[PDB]
Amino acid sequence: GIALGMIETRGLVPAIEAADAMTKAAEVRLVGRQFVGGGYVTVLVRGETGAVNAAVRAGADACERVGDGLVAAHIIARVHSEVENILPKAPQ
Amino acid sequence: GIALGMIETRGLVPAIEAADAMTKAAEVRLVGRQFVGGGYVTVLVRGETGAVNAAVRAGADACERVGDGLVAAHIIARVHSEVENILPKAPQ
Amino acid sequence: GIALGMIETRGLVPAIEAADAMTKAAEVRLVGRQFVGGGYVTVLVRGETGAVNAAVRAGADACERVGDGLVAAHIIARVHSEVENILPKAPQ
Amino acid sequence: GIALGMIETRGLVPAIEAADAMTKAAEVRLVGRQFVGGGYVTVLVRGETGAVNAAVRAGADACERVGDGLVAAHIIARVHSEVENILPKAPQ
């Protein structure tokens, strides 16, 4: 799939909780973890649409109360090819 | 896909109706029908997440009216490799 | 590990939710699902004591509201060699 | 196209939303993503003055309520040649 789930959090401990939750809830792949700055960490998953909706509702609930919290939880069902250049293909 | 959708019903007729409904309404494979006993019969369907969701919804709506009722509708998007053994591993 | 975890439920749909939750949450092996009769289904998970504690708590929190519900969530950290015989070694 | 459109957001999830919205809304070119620091992310698009105006208006509404939100939505119809040294030629 090509749908995109993105969970931003205030820390890496709420982000790892979210990644685990998301990647256990549905058939999604963890494509990246980005340190934005200011203490903002984004875990981006790529799966089919229903899979990503389920994963991002599992991640949000999980990390809502782990560490400093959850900032964003956003699904983008199709991503322009332009936006794919600014997106991580693997988590290393 | 690997998602599992199950409906618990009181009786075999409501269950059969529900199974047929789910199947007709979505791309799911009916893993099987297992009688809990005590009158609970549960029908298992495996599919991609969204399809499973739709199938479950259809089966539910349909068999609530039929018989005593629909005991349960639950969707598990991903099944741990270990949980496989309890679910019928048999299409039959 | 020898600790036993057990979740009896009223139906197989809450039980399957519990087996999934337990397996995903902690490092526990699913050793069996038993149809007791009367619509009671037990799910037995054998692992290490902390793992089994995590598994049983995750399973109960999961199957508590699915279907008819949770009858019991129990941990037995060491079972006597006599109780072993009754317990199912591998799932059927 | 030479015009610049730039959306600054608090975090990367709103920025990815704004970049998708912008690239989809018009014929702009996603030209770079910048991690400023303090959790500010700037997405920059280059297209005709009509294209960039259409894109930034859409991106401003898209990411206004995604994550922390929009810091700035700005359009520069013509950038001085000096400024083009501090502008990314391609996204990284």
Partner: peptide
């Protein structure tokens, strides 16, 4: 009422 992962979105999701 479907019991399982909920496709329906809770408010937090965007």
């Amino acid at each position: 009422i479907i019991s399982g992962t909920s496709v329906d979105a809770s408010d937090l999701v965007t």
